[PDB]
């Protein structure tokens, strides 16, 4: 039951310079680190983290390395700089998961009410959202096995706390606040239309690979029960919103009445005082 | 501005606009409009 946090990308620049470490230390390709913070509410904020020297065998992938020379005494350091910003979770790159993530979560779960494996994004080219959270879950099944622990999608965002723009919005030097309705909306049209419909191509990836070469969560319990929500309105010919078309006349009512009346006042606005300034400039320039 | 073909070419009168919206309508007549009572 966790929705969203507030994210400072400052220690994500620490993810960046540990992404500089791993390019020049050795065989470790992926960035795996430990995410400090403090549960405040269902909304949350993070101020610091750190990056473990981590190795992971390709053979029997449950081979973690989280040193307590690097945990306990560095935890003493991070406790000495502040008592507030303690552990809240950890982080690794890619989007998916590796296998050992569950045990790496359960290692530092002994310190925290809910340790979180926010899977992080170092080379962002994605179609959906950035780094995203997972909470401790016990959902097991309707079958009744020993208790499931694979941490389920209990989401997150990139929230903005406070000032920091002394740095950030001086470091912009490029960007502009679009006075919304000035192709900002069609930036959104591009991103949400194309990136939700090739997210629908990820959905047809699910609904084709789980039909051809895909078993047990094939109709898990949330494929068909959500094909309901897909079956809000999937219909065949033109889907016949017969209520909603005169109701959309009732919609377009307000919009184009403000267009006619208000934009005729906009006509008055530009045109009358524009003629004043214009013709005064014109012949009083004589 | 006379440059065209044309060099050969409310006292009782704006009340006459509503009265020529009234000229085909009930001049005064006052008896007709008082004797439509008593024929029944």
């Amino acid at each position: 039951a966790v929705q969203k946090v507030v994210v400072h990308p400052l220690v994500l620049l620490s993810v960046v310079d540990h992404f500089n470490r791993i390019g020049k230390v050795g065989n470790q390709k992926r960035v795996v680190g430990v995410l400090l913070g403090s549960w405040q509410k269902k909304v949350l904020d993070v101020s610091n983290s750190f990056a473990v020297p981590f190795d992971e065998d390709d053979k029997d992938d449950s081979v973690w390395f989280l040193d307590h020379d690097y945990l306990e005494n560095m935890y003493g350091m991070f406790k000495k700089v502040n008592a507030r910003e303690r552990i809240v979770g950890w982080y690794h790159t890619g989007p998916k998961l590796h296998k050992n993530d569950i045990a790496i979560n359960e290692l530092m779960k002994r310190y925290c009410p809910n340790s979180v494996l926010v899977i992080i994004d170092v080379k962002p080219k994605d179609l959906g959202l950035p780094t995203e959270a997972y909470i401790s879950v016990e959902e097991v099944h309707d079958d009744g096995t020993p208790t499931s622990k694979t941490f389920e999608h209990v989401t997150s965002e990139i929230g903005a706390e406070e000032a920091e723009e002394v740095g950030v919005e001086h470091l912009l030097r490029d960007i502009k606040d679009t006075t919304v309705g000035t192709l900002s909306q069609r930036i959104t049209n591009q991103v949400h239309g194309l990136k939700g419909l090739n997210s629908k191509l990820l959905d047809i990836r699910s609904y084709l690979e789980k039909v051809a070469t895909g078993k047990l969560p094939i109709n898990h319990q949330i494929i068909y029960q959500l094909q309901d929500v897909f079956n809000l309105l999937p219909d065949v010919s033109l889907q016949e919103f017969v209520k909603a078309f005169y109701l959309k006349t009732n919609d377009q009512m307000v919009v184009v009445y403000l267009a006619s009346l208000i934009r005729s006042v906009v006509a008055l606005h530009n045109l009358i005082n524009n003629k004043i300034a214009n013709r005064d400039a014109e012949k009083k320039e004589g | 501005m006379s440059e065209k073909k044309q060099p050969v070419d409310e006292d009782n009168w704006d009340d006459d606009n509503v009265e020529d919206d009234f000229s085909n309508q009930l001049r005064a007549e006052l008896e007709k409009h008082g004797y439509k009572m008593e024929t029944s």
Binding site: L261, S264, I272, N278, R279 | E19, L26, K36, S40
Partner: protein, 189 residues
């Protein structure tokens, strides 16, 4: 003529009761119905000098009531005087049908499925009287309604937020538009 405190009788008023006639003969048209009760119900300073004239009070309270054969009666009294009082003779023709339609508006504002029988109680034989009467009230740009012969429909209508209040802006600023546009076309050459 609202005030009525300082004009008892000067050397300019040979009959203040003619001022009472002048205030009733225009208050019956222009004054609204909350204004009607506000003037001749909430206050008496004209109502003494016209409680010496009870048929005037009777006609205004019948105007406040909607009974129409006494409108014929006392409006005929007022129209006898409207011929027989000056500053009215170039002007009386609008008055008759204007007071008639001033009653006919609230008459139709009563309801919709009306007839000429329930109105002929108030009109007498207002059957082909109302033919030319109400038809030329329709054709005089007035009296928004629909009327039928043998199905005998009546209609009360016009909610104000419909089309014309949406229309009047460009009604002004099309002639006004090309007016100021040609005024901004004298500037080039």
């Amino acid at each position: 003529f609202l005030d009525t405190v300082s004009t008892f009788t000067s050397y300019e008023l040979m009959d203040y009761k003619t001022f009472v006639t002048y205030t009733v003969y225009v208050s019956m048209i222009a004054l609204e119905r909350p204004d009607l009760r506000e003037k001749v119900i909430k206050g008496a300073e004209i109502l003494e000098v016209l409680h010496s004239l009870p048929a005037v009070r009777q006609y205004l309270f019948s105007l406040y009531e909607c009974r129409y054969s006494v409108f014929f009666q006392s409006l005929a009294v007022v129209e006898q005087e409207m011929k027989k009082d000056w500053l009215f003779a170039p002007h009386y023709r609008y008055y008759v049908r204007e007071m008639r339609i001033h009653a006919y508006s609230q008459l139709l504002e009563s309801y919709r499925s009306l007839t000429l029988g329930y109105m002929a109680e108030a009109f007498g034989v207002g059957v082909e009287f109302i033919d030319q009467e109400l038809s030329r009230f329709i054709a005089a740009g007035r009296l928004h309604c629909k009327i039928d012969k043998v199905n005998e429909i009546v209609e009360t209508n016009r909610p104000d937020s419909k089309n014309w209040q949406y229309q009047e802006t460009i009604k002004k600023g099309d002639l006004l538009l090309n007016r100021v546009q040609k005024l901004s076309r004298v500037i080039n050459m």
